[PDB]
Design a binder for this molecule. Structure first.
Ligand SMILES: Nc1ncnc2c1ncn2[C@@H]1O[C@H](CSCC[C@H](N)C(=O)O)[C@@H](O)[C@H]1O
Length: 282
């Protein structure tokens, strides 16, 4: 359906290498039930000038927001994970994650179904200069996860997420796992994705807003935790990621301990070489 061939494919889905703002267009319209991601944030993003990173970043991301509006079903949701950030050499917060919010409702026309908040106890990006050293700010440990929806009535059922009705606050930490992806990464002498989220994050939203066989898309795949979860929960998925290293290593997530190291490198390099692996069988 897309203008390319997936890096790899499994039982319920397939991951592509490429720019998601292009690939999204290949989806029919009102076809996606849940788009779940956490955008790449480093000093702005693709947009010339350098006017106020806050604004440049916002415009960049709003582009994806626009196309995602079209492709989401009327009962569809667009959950977005954002991490706080200070500005260069000053202990004043950037409010880029909040600017996205306002312009998404005002300009794009989304609705904030509900604002969620993720507390990750163990978080290293905590800026030592302001916290540990100067002792002027506290551990930056809460991420603004915005659950957006195409209409005021997106598909949702909190009983599949029952704790006892749970709250607005999700307390999860990145590693409550060991897994073969970390091991297989170590094998290739490569580093695991620099910034990936715990499986429980997308699990919560996959279970709550979608039913089995629903299409869960992730426009900034990374290590593909989403597709992984969407797989073991029996939803259909599709992920887009720009970097081949990330896609290649992510494939490991869909294998077992019982695989020759010689076969792992083959899978890694073949994907890194542009081949289309059908992981469903060898
Ligand atoms: N325009 C683009 N299209 C597709 N992927 C993109 C992109 N711009 C940035 N990316 C990818 O966006 C990812 C953001 S981090 C993704 C982490 C993911 N949730 C997981 O747990 O790993 C980064 O890997 C970045 O390389």
């Amino acid at each position: 359906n897309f203008g390319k061939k997936p890096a790899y494919t499994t039982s319920n889905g397939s991951m592509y290498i490429g720019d998601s703002l292009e690939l999204l267009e290949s989806f029919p319209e009102e076809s996606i039930s849940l788009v779940m991601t956490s955008p790449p944030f480093a000093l702005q993003r693709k947009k010339e000038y350098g006017n106020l990173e806050q604004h440049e970043y916002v415009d960049w991301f709003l582009s994806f927001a626009k196309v995602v509006n079209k492709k989401l079903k009327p009962d569809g949701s667009f959950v977005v994970d954002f991490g706080g950030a200070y500005m260069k050499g000053v202990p004043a917060r950037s409010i880029y994650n909040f600017r996205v919010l306002i312009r998404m409702i005002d300009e794009v026309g989304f609705f904030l179904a509900e604002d969620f908040y993720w507390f990750n106890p163990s978080k290293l990006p905590s800026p030592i200069e302001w916290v540990n050293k100067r002792k002027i700010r506290v551990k930056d440990a809460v991420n603004t996860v915005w659950w957006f929806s195409k209409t005021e009535w997106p598909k949702s059922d909190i009983t599949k997420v029952l704790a006892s009705i749970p709250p607005n606050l999700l307390q999860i930490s990145n590693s409550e796992s060991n897994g073969q992806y970390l091991a297989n990464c170590k094998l290739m002498g490569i580093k695991a994705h620099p910034a990936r989220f715990p499986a429980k994050l997308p699990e919560f939203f996959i279970r709550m807003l979608t039913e089995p066989d629903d299409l869960v898309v992730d426009i900034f795949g990374g290590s593909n935790t989403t597709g992984l979860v969407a797989e073991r929960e029996s939803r259909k998925w599709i992920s887009f990621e720009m970097k081949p290293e990330y896609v290649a290593a992510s494939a490991f997530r869909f294998l077992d301990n019982n695989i020759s190291e010689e076969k792992i490198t083959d899978i890694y390099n073949r994907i890194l070489n542009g081949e289309s692996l059908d992981l469903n069988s060898i």
